[PDB]
Enzyme design. Structure first.
Site, PDB file in Angstrom:
ATOM      1  N   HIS B  41       9.828 -20.185  16.289  1.00  0.00           N
ATOM      2  CA  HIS B  41      10.001 -21.222  17.103  1.00  0.00           C
ATOM      3  C   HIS B  41      10.633 -22.379  16.496  1.00  0.00           C
ATOM      4  O   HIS B  41      10.753 -23.545  17.116  1.00  0.00           O
ATOM      5  CB  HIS B  41       8.540 -21.732  17.636  1.00  0.00           C
ATOM      6  CG  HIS B  41       7.720 -22.294  16.472  1.00  0.00           C
ATOM      7  ND1 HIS B  41       7.952 -23.438  16.207  1.00  0.00           N
ATOM      8  CD2 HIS B  41       6.522 -22.099  16.036  1.00  0.00           C
ATOM      9  CE1 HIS B  41       7.022 -24.161  15.360  1.00  0.00           C
ATOM     10  NE2 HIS B  41       6.030 -23.017  15.215  1.00  0.00           N
ATOM     11  N   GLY B 143       4.386 -30.481  11.430  1.00  0.00           N
ATOM     12  CA  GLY B 143       5.533 -30.284  10.588  1.00  0.00           C
ATOM     13  C   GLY B 143       4.547 -29.410   9.542  1.00  0.00           C
ATOM     14  O   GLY B 143       5.461 -28.974   8.495  1.00  0.00           O
ATOM     15  N   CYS B 145       3.891 -26.023  10.231  1.00  0.00           N
ATOM     16  CA  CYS B 145       4.410 -24.786  10.589  1.00  0.00           C
ATOM     17  C   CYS B 145       5.178 -24.117   9.295  1.00  0.00           C
ATOM     18  O   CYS B 145       5.968 -24.842   8.821  1.00  0.00           O
ATOM     19  CB  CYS B 145       5.105 -24.753  11.804  1.00  0.00           C
ATOM     20  SG  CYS B 145       4.318 -25.823  12.942  1.00  0.00           S
TER      21      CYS B 145
HETATM   22  C1  LIG Z   1       9.214 -29.432  17.463  1.00  0.00           C
HETATM   23  N1  LIG Z   1       8.128 -29.375  16.381  1.00  0.00           N
HETATM   24  C2  LIG Z   1       7.098 -28.766  16.534  1.00  0.00           C
HETATM   25  C3  LIG Z   1       6.126 -28.296  15.384  1.00  0.00           C
HETATM   26  C4  LIG Z   1       4.780 -27.665  15.792  1.00  0.00           C
HETATM   27  C5  LIG Z   1       5.104 -26.857  16.862  1.00  0.00           C
HETATM   28  C6  LIG Z   1       3.602 -26.449  17.513  1.00  0.00           C
HETATM   29  C7  LIG Z   1       3.572 -25.317  18.525  1.00  0.00           C
HETATM   30  C8  LIG Z   1       4.418 -24.316  18.393  1.00  0.00           C
HETATM   31  C9  LIG Z   1       4.159 -23.338  19.363  1.00  0.00           C
HETATM   32 CL1  LIG Z   1       5.794 -22.058  19.441  1.00  0.00          CL
HETATM   33  C10 LIG Z   1       3.470 -23.521  20.498  1.00  0.00           C
HETATM   34  F1  LIG Z   1       3.600 -22.443  21.288  1.00  0.00           F
HETATM   35  C11 LIG Z   1       2.329 -24.542  20.436  1.00  0.00           C
HETATM   36  O1  LIG Z   1       1.618 -24.368  21.478  1.00  0.00           O
HETATM   37  C12 LIG Z   1       0.309 -25.243  21.538  1.00  0.00           C
HETATM   38  C13 LIG Z   1      -0.537 -25.126  22.848  1.00  0.00           C
HETATM   39  C14 LIG Z   1      -0.463 -26.342  23.688  1.00  0.00           C
HETATM   40  C15 LIG Z   1      -1.060 -25.925  24.912  1.00  0.00           C
HETATM   41  C16 LIG Z   1      -1.987 -24.861  24.953  1.00  0.00           C
HETATM   42  C17 LIG Z   1      -1.933 -23.875  24.248  1.00  0.00           C
HETATM   43  C18 LIG Z   1      -1.186 -24.237  23.009  1.00  0.00           C
HETATM   44 CL2  LIG Z   1      -1.139 -22.705  21.707  1.00  0.00          CL
HETATM   45  C19 LIG Z   1       2.389 -25.403  19.442  1.00  0.00           C
HETATM   46  C20 LIG Z   1       2.406 -26.604  16.561  1.00  0.00           C
HETATM   47  O2  LIG Z   1       1.077 -26.056  17.052  1.00  0.00           O
HETATM   48  N2  LIG Z   1       2.449 -27.909  15.575  1.00  0.00           N
HETATM   49  C21 LIG Z   1       1.363 -28.162  15.024  1.00  0.00           C
HETATM   50  C22 LIG Z   1       0.657 -29.277  15.055  1.00  0.00           C
HETATM   51  C23 LIG Z   1      -0.308 -29.634  14.199  1.00  0.00           C
HETATM   52  C24 LIG Z   1      -1.125 -28.752  13.518  1.00  0.00           C
HETATM   53  N3  LIG Z   1      -0.529 -27.429  13.204  1.00  0.00           N
HETATM   54  C25 LIG Z   1       0.687 -27.078  13.887  1.00  0.00           C
HETATM   55  C26 LIG Z   1       3.762 -28.214  15.255  1.00  0.00           C
HETATM   56  C27 LIG Z   1       6.594 -28.747  14.181  1.00  0.00           C
HETATM   57  O3  LIG Z   1       5.734 -28.594  12.916  1.00  0.00           O
HETATM   58  N4  LIG Z   1       7.807 -29.562  14.078  1.00  0.00           N
HETATM   59  C28 LIG Z   1       8.692 -29.518  14.997  1.00  0.00           C
HETATM   60  O4  LIG Z   1       9.724 -30.180  14.779  1.00  0.00           O
END
Ligand SMILES: Cn1cc(-c2cc(-c3cc(Cl)c(F)c(OCc4ccccc4Cl)c3)c(=O)n(-c3cccnc3)c2)c(=O)[nH]c1=O
Lengths: 305, 301
Positions: B41, B143, B145
């Site tokens: 992703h 950030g 991930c």
């Molecule tokens: C653009 N972007 C995005 C991320 C990033 C993406 C995510 C993330 C990625 C994918 Cl594919 C998801 F389907 C997702 O759905 C969450 C969700 C929402 C509603 C119902 C069910 C579900 Cl499951 C979330 C994330 O969960 N986090 C995160 C945050 C806090 C702690 N741990 C992880 C971070 C990043 O780190 N950097 C960056 O630039």
């Protein structure tokens, strides 16, 4: 989201651990530049530990009484020296993995990571606090002496602790890296007990703020106490007194959550008298006191090194 | 003596962490030999969150759309492929700090260490377990991930988890290093709740053996139980079923302490019925389930 007991990354410290042998005793050493640091009681026999004369035991020793292994490489000891309760072995080779570092002495209530080692080999890392009674509640087995505790600030390792002994109650005692003991303890095989421990109030409050930040809110109320009133409650429950410096340090967390410190003290006051009423806080049934305000800020803001 | 939740020394993993940027999305990658592994992703936009077509997004990318940074050094991407939910970036330089490693898929109840990272730099290390509902109760921010979970045995790092996302309830989901998700989760932002989080019974029992090893016996009793009667009771507290496999696994700890596995099961049944009554076990006021039988032997001996 989430909140864990988090240790510093230990890589900078792993590259400094070595094995030190003298006679039949093997323990761990800290190899920085061309000096290896280890507890001075490595030079003692079981009979010596009863009432040692360290300067006399060391006069009777030479450089070759010390076997130093860095992995599979023998390190040649060219000189030895004692600084307080710590032995300093000069070696012929500088540690090429020596990080930026300094020796610091921490205050009770402050936290640090311990890299538990055996025969110079790192086996695990865990986060802990220096207790108000100057012990640490560690996890150590035979051979763990010489393992170190540390903090990391940017790229600099602040070494604060070297492990020396286990006390009869199962808690642990050691020195800073200049060999000064933390607590009223001596490196001698005699009956020694730590004073009555107390709970680190300012750390409990920080952890309640971490709980609020993570959505755990049931313990908040509409009330406020005074420092005087709270410290009378704290004294009753063997809690460290809360000072004005403590309240100021919690300042940022009070700003971010909207809960003033003495509001949280009222929550904590109520938790002490009434208990947790069958509930938990951040997955704990106890009030956790091994997170400082700075720990909480760092973990909840994602600071890196 | 003493008993703490120790993590593995993180140094071998620290030397593998890199930053991966695509568009405006930046997360962590794992640099082993000449391959950087990261969540796929990374290639998504905000408009792609609900139904990303990863094969379609990826075919449109070229190597220079991926900025990989190891410390201050930019690494040149020379090729990319996708394997399940993990992106594999081929780089022109092998990592000189690559340790001995393997990729392992773990089962619920297994423990491992997490090196939480942001922008390719480690923040901290902690120990946790794969819950029975295939989530982990981590500590992760935006950030994070691409951070990985691992065990270390001798000098071999067994990578078992790569962090992908935080579910709405605050728990975490990820994949093995072949990119297969643990549990029923998918990498898009549609509704997906995790199953009921149950307690890892075999781990609780192992931790009670650790308590006896460390000198604490206050919770034992004079009862025994059948395996079936234990499970009928424990499952009413949302405990996982204990299998004969689990019983065999606890055999060494039984022999060391002289307490039969089914006798310790009797003690656990009484502890669920009574609670702690103001007492603690190994410094906890709850029953701890994130130490495996293997962990307990490791730390106590
Ligand atoms: C653009 N972007 C995005 C991320 C990033 C993406 C995510 C993330 C990625 C994918 Cl594919 C998801 F389907 C997702 O759905 C969450 C969700 C929402 C509603 C119902 C069910 C579900 Cl499951 C979330 C994330 O969960 N986090 C995160 C945050 C806090 C702690 N741990 C992880 C971070 C990043 O780190 N950097 C960056 O630039």
């Amino acid at each position: 989201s989430g909140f864990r007991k988090m240790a510093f990354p230990s890589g900078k410290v792993e590259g400094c651990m070595v094995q030190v042998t003298c006679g039949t005793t093997t323990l761990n050493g800290l190899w920085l530049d061309d000096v290896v640091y280890c507890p001075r009681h490595v030079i003692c026999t079981s009979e010596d530990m009863l009432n040692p004369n360290y300067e006399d035991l060391l006069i009777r020793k030479s450089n070759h009484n010390f076997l130093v292994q860095a992995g599979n490489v023998q390190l040649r000891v060219i000189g030895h020296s004692m600084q307080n309760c710590v032995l300093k072995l000069k070696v012929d080779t500088a540690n090429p993995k020596t990080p930026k570092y300094k020796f610091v002495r921490i205050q009770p209530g402050q936290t640090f990571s311990v890299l538990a080692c055996y025969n110079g080999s790192p086996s695990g890392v865990y986060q802990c606090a220096m207790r108000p009674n100057f012990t640490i509640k560690g996890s150590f087995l035979n051979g763990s002496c010489g393992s170190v505790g540390f903090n990391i600030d940017y790229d600099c390792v602040s070494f604060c602790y070297m492990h020396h002994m286990e006390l009869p109650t199962g808690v642990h005692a050691g020195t800073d890296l200049e060999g000064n003991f933390y607590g009223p303890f001596v490196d001698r095989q005699i009956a020694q007990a730590a004073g009555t421990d107390t709970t680190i109030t300012v750390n409990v409050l920080a952890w309640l703020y971490a709980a609020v930040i993570n959505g755990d809110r049931w313990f908040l109320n509409r009330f406020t106490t005074t420092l005087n009133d709270f410290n009378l409650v704290a004294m009753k429950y063997n809690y460290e007194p809360l000072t004005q410096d403590h309240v100021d340090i919690l300042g940022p967390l009070s700003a971010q959550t909207g809960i003033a410190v003495l509001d949280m003290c009222a929550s904590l006051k109520e938790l002490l008298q009434n208990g947790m009423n069958g509930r938990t806080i951040l997955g704990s049934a106890l009030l956790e006191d091994e997170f400082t305000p700075f720990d909480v800020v760092r973990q909840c803001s994602g600071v890196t090194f």
